[PDB]
Every structure is written in structure tokens, then in C-alpha cells.
Design a protein around this ligand. Structure first.
Ligand code: LDI
Ligand code: K
Ligand code: K
Ligand code: NA
Ligand code: ZN
Length: 642
């Protein structure tokens, strides 16, 4: 299994620049690259990646996406003087040329292909190419918007040809619409293209009618193009995450790509002069994290735009941190997307409901700038501690560790707790269980030496109490509890400090807005129903709740095995990954699977997802209706005003 992250960069790509005055192009500077790489070096991230050399894309490779006539014209620019370069540039929209730009365009494209090869050959898990010129505007026979050749369209066409992939996802989170990519794959169902972009009702560059939500692709590609137009500036973390939870991720996990390529422009970040959005650099840590359970983690991130040198460096680091597996930062202050974003989200979900099973229920009546520097992200010395039953030895990943050695002081705390709340209990195994929970929780919270952990236990009720109560006093301001099982637990959700997600089998009426109870019909379609609930209900609430600890609980009485790995991976977006899972009873497969996802290993794909049953969808949309007034990140429609 593959490990490591590639970082592909070469100083040569900073060796072209604008040679005449032009306020439109003067923002695209060599320093975008040098400042980004130097920020990765300053934070120690470059040193932790496998440096892979750039190469030139060959003529045959360029012709995958571009016409001979355009290639021949561009091939002439190294021989042009400044006057001739200016006149050549003016044939195109928002683009300038330089004696060295043809050379650099072949390097940006080849660097992208080097990244695809490193990932598809399992030489690294994932990676990023820091390249310029960018690519996503370039078209079959035209340069456009700083772009000469279409780096990301190369990557998908190359991965199709050389690795015979049938399903590729392209996520374009640059603030501009990648119309070059859209045109390239408009009729191709093997490449799913998602783009969000500043649009402002077509008044924002590139001013195209086909950048709107109504372009779903053409012919056999209908449904495999997803445009999400932003019709106001100032979109926030909540707008971006609502886009991911209610549009992109439902489609992404149903499509089940074999490779994910990100057109990663950071002009969608706060402070950028072209985007004018307000999302913090930390959001890209989460956009990256939420895509990583796809395609067994095979993700190629390709730099596009981003023009505020400060937010550019910070956003590049947040992404690579996430590619390397470092704990995600906590995002505070989340809530409802704004009305304009809810309108775009609602319109795209509705036009796409003909094509995607997560939206199908919508079709029938039955239904300068300043911001705080991001905090440091340290990988934990031991990521995951594990406490199997006594005597059970397991082969663990290199970043996991057993931990049964109860201290002296911890053992005094257990005696304390027994005397006070469970005077009538002497089962010395359950009492060892409590020692393990407390000692694991102390390592997780009191230090950056451990990130998360998993304990096998005998008795749920006393285990849950000690875990929850010990976390609350530490103090952890808020705790998210995810419980797979039936019956009530010793959990009080009345003070706002706990949110309880419960996945059960008996339909229990929901009282308060600090509980989400999902009773899913057992059968063939349990997997799709759980994923739909996870992406559209559990993650939105969890992200808004913003817990300091996640507590997972699995009752011994398990169609879990299909989807427990995806939940465990995705739920580490909360609480900087600090999650404690309690497994009742020994189940080797479940224990190994939990430890694997907790430890940052790649998650195996679910396969293309069949459809959820209507009874389950109705159940989930009733939960949304009940909860979205309190938890606004659940909203995916505009609210009715009085
Ligand atoms: O980041 C990017 N693509 O991802 C680029 C793409 C094109 N932009 C320039 C477009 N300027 C249009 C314009 C011209 C004249 C008056 C007003 C507006 C800059 C960022
Ligand atoms: K975009
Ligand atoms: K397509
Ligand atoms: Na021009
Ligand atoms: Zn852009």
C-alpha cells in the first residue's frame, strides 16, 4: 500500500513574467510560485514530501487536448521579440506571453503528468504540483485567462489513456470557472467536472452563459458537469462547506471516482483581489480532507490561481498538511449558507435531480484585508493508541501503538470513580477498561503525543459514563457522540455540551435539537442510506457543533463494515481528529478497520452506490426539517420568510 505525498516544483516555472504594462495581467507573478514553495519550506512540509522532478510534456501529450494549429502558433513564441509577443497576446482574452512561457507551459503540463504517474503507479498516496502558468481556462485552440495549455485536462486524458480509468473526478475550487475543462469533457461521462465560481449573474469574467447551473453536460455526458455559480462576493467557510455537503460530496461518493484531480486555485480564499471571497485558508484543509476517502486516497492537486501572496502561502500549506495526514484545524463560527448561496445550491440540486440518486427525491411531489494566522498543525508522535482485549496481539500500522500500562495516578482515579458512582462493581476487567479509557483520553488531550484511540470494552453504560464525564471535566467544551446501537445511553443532551448522533434499528421519536436519530431500514440499500445521512446530515451538524472530542460507540450486536471506515475517516475533520472509539465485544475485522481509518490509512472504495430506499430518504428529510432551524449548515434550500 502506498505512502507519502509528492510535491512537484521547479524554479524554472518562475522564469517568465509580464513584459509590458497591463493592469489586467499584472497580478500573475513569478512570486506566486516562489512564495508558495518557501512557505512550504518554512513550515517543514516540503521536507516531508517526496520531491519528484518536473519534465516537459511531449508534443503527443499536448495534442491530447489541443489542436496542431494552436500548438504550432505557441511553439513560435520563443523566437518573438516584445512587440511580437504583445501582438500575439492580444489575439486572446486576459493572457500574456513571454520568450520562456512556452517552455514553462510544457513544464507545468509535464509536472502534472509526473504527479499522475507517481500516484497511479502507487509510488505516493497523493500529491501536489506547484506549477505556472495555470491551465483551467485554456481551450483546444486558445490561450485564455493566464492559461496556455490545460494542465488538469491533460491529467485526466492521460490517466484515461495510460491507466484505462473509467471514472475521474475533477474538483475545480479556483474562484473562476474552468470553462476549458468543461468544454473538454462536456460529452464525456467518464470525467465528472465540478466547479464553483464567482459569477454574479454572468457579469463576472469570463461572462459565459454556460457557466451557469443549467449546463449539466451534453449527450452521453449529461449530468457529469456541475456548475455552482456564486452570485454575490464574500462567500464564507459556511458557504463552501454547504456546497461540499449538499452538492459535491453526494455526487462524488455516488460516482465513485478511480482518481481525483483538484484544480486548486486559491483565489477563492480571503484577501484575494480577484475572488473577493472570505473563506479562511483553513477551509482548504477540510476541502482536501473531505475528498481524501475517494479513490483510495489517490488525489492530484494542481495549482491554478491565487494572487494574495499571504493567503496563497497559507492555503497551500493547509492543503499539503492535509495531504500528509496532519490533524485538521477546528473551524469555528459555522452556520447557514447565505441566501444567495442557498439559491445557487437549491438550483443546481434541482437541475441535477434527473441524474443523481442523492437528489432524485426532489423531482417528485411525494418527496488591505487582515485575518488571524492559522495555528500550527503538528503530526502526533503516535497517531493512534489501541487497547485490544487482554492477551490479543495485533499487527499494527507503524504509527499505532498498544497502551494498556495504567499509571499509578490513573489507577487512583478509577478507585475514586468506582467508590462514588458504581460502588457495587468488582469485575476487575471492566475496571481495567476504565483505566484504559482514562489513560487513553489523557494522552489524547493533555498532549500532542497521541491524536486518537480505540478501546475494546465489556460494559457500555459504565464505559460511556467514564469516557464522557472524564472528557467533560478535562475540560472539553463540547463532545460529539456517535452511537451505533439501540437503547438509551447514560448521555445527557440538555446543557448544549453534547450532541448525540445515534444510528439504530427501532424508530424512536426525536425530542430535542441536540440529538439526531437515524433509523435505517435493514437490507440491501443500507450502505447508500448511511452515506446519504453522513454527508447531508451528520457532517453538517458536526461541523457546526464544532466538538473538542468525538466519542464513537458501537454496540456488540454489523453491516457497519461497509461504511464504518468512511465515517471514521470523515469524522476526523472535527476536533482536530481527536476521536475515542469504544467497541463493545471483540470483532477482529471491526477493530482492525477502526484502527486503520483512525491511523490515517487509505479507505477502500465503496463501489458505485445503488439507490437509497424512499422510506429512508423521507426519514432523513424529516430530520433535516426538524433540525435546520437550529443547525443552519443543514440547509440546502432558501428559507421561507414570514
Ligand atoms: O485566476 C484566474 N483564473 O483562474 C484569472 C483569470 C482572468 N482574470 C482576469 C480577468 N479580467 C477581466 C477584466 C478585464 C477588464 C476589465 C474588467 C475585468 C484574472 C484571474
Ligand atoms: K472553479
Ligand atoms: K463530463
Ligand atoms: Na488583452
Ligand atoms: Zn482563478
Amino acid at each position: 500500500a502506498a505512502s507519502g505525498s509528492a510535491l512537484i516544483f521547479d524554479e524554472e516555472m518562475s522564469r517568465y513574467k509580464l513584459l509590458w504594462t497591463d493592469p489586467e495581467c499584472e497580478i500573475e507573478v513569478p512570486e506566486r510560485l516562489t512564495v508558495s514553495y518557501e512557505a512550504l519550506r518554512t513550515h517543514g512540509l516540503a521536507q516531508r514530501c517526496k520531491a519528484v522532478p518536473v519534465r516537459q510534456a511531449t508534443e503527443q501529450e499536448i495534442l491530447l487536448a489541443h489542436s496542431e494549429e494552436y500548438l504550432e502558433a505557441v511553439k513560435q513564441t520563443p523566437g518573438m521579440n516584445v512587440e511580437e509577443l504583445m501582438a500575439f497576446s492580444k489575439k486572446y482574452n486576459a493572457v500574456y506571453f513571454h520568450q520562456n512561457i512556452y517552455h514553462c507551459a510544457k513544464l507545468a503540463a509535464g509536472a502534472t503528468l509526473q504527479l499522475v504517474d507517481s500516484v497511479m503507479k502507487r509510488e505516493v498516496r497523493n500529491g501536489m504540483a506547484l506549477v505556472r502558468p495555470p491551465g483551467h481556462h485554456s481551450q483546444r485552440s486558445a490561450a485564455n485567462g493566464f492559461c496556455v495549455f490545460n494542465n488538469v485536462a491533460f491529467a485526466a486524458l492521460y490517466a484515461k489513456k495510460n491507466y484505462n480509468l473509467n471514472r475521474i473526478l475533477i474538483v475545480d475550487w479556483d474562484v473562476h470557472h474552468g470553462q476549458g475543462i468543461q468544454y473538454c469533457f462536456e460529452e464525456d461521462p467518464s470525467v465528472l467536472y465540478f466547479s464553483w465560481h464567482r459569477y454574479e449573474h454572468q457579469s463576472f469574467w469570463p461572462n459565459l452563459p454556460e457557466s451557469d447551473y443549467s449546463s449539466v453536460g451534453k449527450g452521453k455526458g449529461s449530468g457529469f458537469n456541475i456548475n455552482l455559480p456564486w452570485n454575490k462576493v464574500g462567500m464564507t467557510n459556511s458557504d463552501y462547506l454547504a456546497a461540499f455537503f449538499h452538492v459535491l460530496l453526494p455526487v462524488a461518493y455516488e460516482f465513485d471516482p478511480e482518481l481525483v484531480i483538484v484544480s486548486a486555485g486559491f483565489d477563492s480564499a480571503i484577501g484575494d483581489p480577484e475572488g473577493e471571497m472570505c473563506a479562511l485558508p483553513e477551509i482548504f484543509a477540510h476541502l482536501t480532507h473531505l475528498l481524501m476517502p475517494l479513490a483510495a486516497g489517490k488525489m492530484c492537486v494542481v495549482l491554478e490561481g491565487g494572487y494574495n501572496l499571504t493567503s496563497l502561502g497559507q492555503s497551500v500549506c493547509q492543503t499539503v498538511h492535509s495531504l500528509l495526514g496532519d490533524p485538521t484545524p477546528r473551524i469555528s463560527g459555522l452556520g447557514t449558507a447565505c441566501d444567495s448561496a442557498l439559491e445557487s445550491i437549491q438550483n443546481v440540486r434541482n437541475v441535477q435531480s434527473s441524474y443523481w440518486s442523492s437528489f432524485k427525491h426532489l423531482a417528485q411531489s411525494e418527496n488591505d484585508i487582515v485575518w488571524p494566522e492559522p495555528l500550527k498543525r503538528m503530526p502526533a508522535s503516535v497517531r493512534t493508541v489501541v487497547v485490544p482485549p487482554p492477551g490479543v496481539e495485533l499487527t499494527l500500522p507503524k504509527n499505532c501503538q498498544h497502551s494498556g500500562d495504567i499509571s499509578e495516578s490513573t489507577a487512583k482515579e478509577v478507585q475514586r470513580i468506582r467508590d462514588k458512582h458504581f460502588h457495587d462493581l468488582t469485575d476487575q476487567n471492566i475496571l481495567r477498561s476504565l483505566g484504559n479509557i482514562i489513560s487513553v483520553l489523557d494522552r489524547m488531550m493533555r498532549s500532542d503525543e497521541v491524536c486518537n484511540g480505540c478501546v475494546v470494552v465489556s460494559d457500555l453504560s459504565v464505559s460511556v459514563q467514564c469516557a464522557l464525564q472524564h472528557a467533560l471535566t478535562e475540560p472539553a467544551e463540547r463532545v460529539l457522540v456517535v452511537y451505533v446501537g439501540d437503547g438509551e445511553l447514560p448521555v445527557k443532551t440538555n446543557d448544549g455540551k453534547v450532541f448525540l448522533v445515534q444510528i439504530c434499528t427501532k424508530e424512536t421519536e426525536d425530542k430535542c435539537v441536540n440529538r439526531l436519530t437515524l433509523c435505517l431500514r435493514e437490507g440491501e440499500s443500507l450502505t447508500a442510506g448511511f452515506m446519504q445521512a453522513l454527508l447531508g446530515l451528520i457532517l453538517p451538524v458536526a461541523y457546526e457543533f464544532n466538538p473538542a472530542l468525538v466519542l464513537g460507540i458501537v454496540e456488540e450486536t454489523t453491516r457497519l463494515m461497509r461504511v464504518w471506515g468512511h465515517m471514521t475517516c470523515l469524522i476526523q475533520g472535527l476536533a482536530r481528529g481527536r476521536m475515542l472509539t469504544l467497541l463493545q465485544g471483540y470483532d477482529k475485522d471491526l477493530l482492525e478497520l477502526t484502527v486503520s481509518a483512525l491511523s490515517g490509512a487509505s479507505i477502500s472504495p465503496l463501489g458505485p452506490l445503488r439507490a437509497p430506499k424512499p422510506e429512508d430518504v423521507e426519514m432523513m428529510e424529516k430530520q433535516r426539517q426538524r433540525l435546520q432551524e437550529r443547525w443552519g449548515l443543514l440547509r440546502c434550500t432558501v428559507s421561507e420568510s414570514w
